[PDB]
Amino acid sequence: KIEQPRWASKDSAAGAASTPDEKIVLEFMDALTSNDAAKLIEYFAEDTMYQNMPLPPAYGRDAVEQTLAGLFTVMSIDAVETFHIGSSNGLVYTERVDVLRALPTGKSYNLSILGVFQLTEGKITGWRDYFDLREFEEAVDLPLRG
Amino acid sequence: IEQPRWASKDSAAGAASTPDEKIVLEFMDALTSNDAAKLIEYFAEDTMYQNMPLPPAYGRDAVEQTLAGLFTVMSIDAVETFHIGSSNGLVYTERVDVLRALPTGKSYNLSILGVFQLTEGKITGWRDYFDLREFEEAVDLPLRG
Ligand SMILES: CCCCCCC(N)=O
Ligand SMILES: CCCCCCC(N)=O
């Protein structure tokens, strides 16, 4: 289902959480498959932001929650695999694939993502995922800018 | 390039704190050369490069040929790295690159998160993640061919 890329690191520590903040980010990655905005919002600070970089940002925990609730109305996150995780200066970075299934069409796509997370006292204060939107949209037959 | 609300204003934010980070920031400075021959010197023979919306290039020659093609169609006019970090042999850069499409004269500020793998100071992998369509629409050139 998710295959291992040729460029995957051979350093085990590169694929494992190596700090307390990295551990929380991997727990959050595991939780994504719940498709549950109310569960996921508990990982967030009140003063926070979320952006899927092809689309506009959400600022503040309520906007974040409302975005996730909309997302999970249209798609399921069926699987997440994080190949690489690392961190510096209060930012955690994840190189991953998320398997996304469009609820209106039944079609799925393996989306390659590089994301960044800012944690303050173990809660998410920023989350930005970078990826290409058009290939995903074309694969699952749903225009994801509206 | 103006500063995002979310970008750190810390004096150290996008500054290198390791040898590998230092090499990556030198590489970022070198991108505005638009010079594939200059850039390829940063790479190991066993390497790869991918702009993630498009297919990867494997091996140093393929990487060089990709860069030479890239610089035939666009200029990287500026690069600003907001955040840099690293662990376990990988370096990450959150940046904006200002790209100008030579056929049309139009520019776009492209938001990118990239990852670099280094072995003995040379690049064994470079992957940049971003949205291609928004860029294509802004500069009037179909970037998948
Ligand atoms: C708006 C579509 C983007 C959803 C990607 C969600 C994810 N992180 O897998
Ligand atoms: C296919 C277009 C991608 C070019 C991005 C180059 C860069 N890193 O600024």
Swiss-Prot record, chain A:
Changing N52A: Almost no activity. It comes from the Bacteria. The active site is at D98, D129. The keyword Hydrolase applies. Induction: By growth on monoterpenes. Optimum temperature is 50 degrees Celsius. Pfam families: LEH (PF07858). GO terms for molecular function: limonene-1,2-epoxide hydrolase activity. Keywords: Hydrolase. It catalyses: limonene 1,2-epoxide + H2O = limonene-1,2-diol. Optimum pH is 7. Signal peptide: none annotated. InterPro entries: LEH (IPR013100), NTF2-like_dom_sf (IPR032710). Its EC number is 3.3.2.8. The keyword Hydrolase applies. Pathway: Terpene metabolism; (4R)-limonene degradation; (1S,4R)-1-hydroxylimonen-2-one from (4R)-limonene: step 2/3. SUPFAM superfamilies: NTF2-like. Catalyzes the conversion of limonene-1,2-epoxide to limonene-1,2-diol. Can use both the (-) and (+) isomers of limonene-1,2-epoxide as substrates and also has some activity with 1-methylcyclohexene oxide, cyclohexene oxide and indene oxide as substrates. Monomer. Belongs to the limonene-1,2-epoxide hydrolase family. This is Limonene-1,2-epoxide hydrolase. The lineage of its organism: Bacteria, Bacillati, Actinomycetota, Actinomycetes, Mycobacteriales. The gene is limA.
